[PDB]
Fold dynamin 3.
Amino acid sequence: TPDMAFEAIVKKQIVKLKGPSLKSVDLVIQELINTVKKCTKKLANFPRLC
Amino acid sequence: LSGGASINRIFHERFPFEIVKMEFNEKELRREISYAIKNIHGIRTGLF
């Protein structure tokens, strides 16, 4: 049985993890940018600084 | 003994025997094979 056929199919499946993985980074970026905006409401009294 | 009858002996008695005579030296042949399977694989792994 083709050793390389196994590898061929797997490599297809592994590549499919790029989507949900990049998405994850974005979901983190979202929570991070939300948090810096949450914190900086305590500095709102200074418009140019915030 | 005639020529043509001898030819039959060449074809069906000599030729087979000449073939049988070339020794495999299998122990050294088996080594060749084992080396061969490791080399096709090599940098890849295992099954199948």
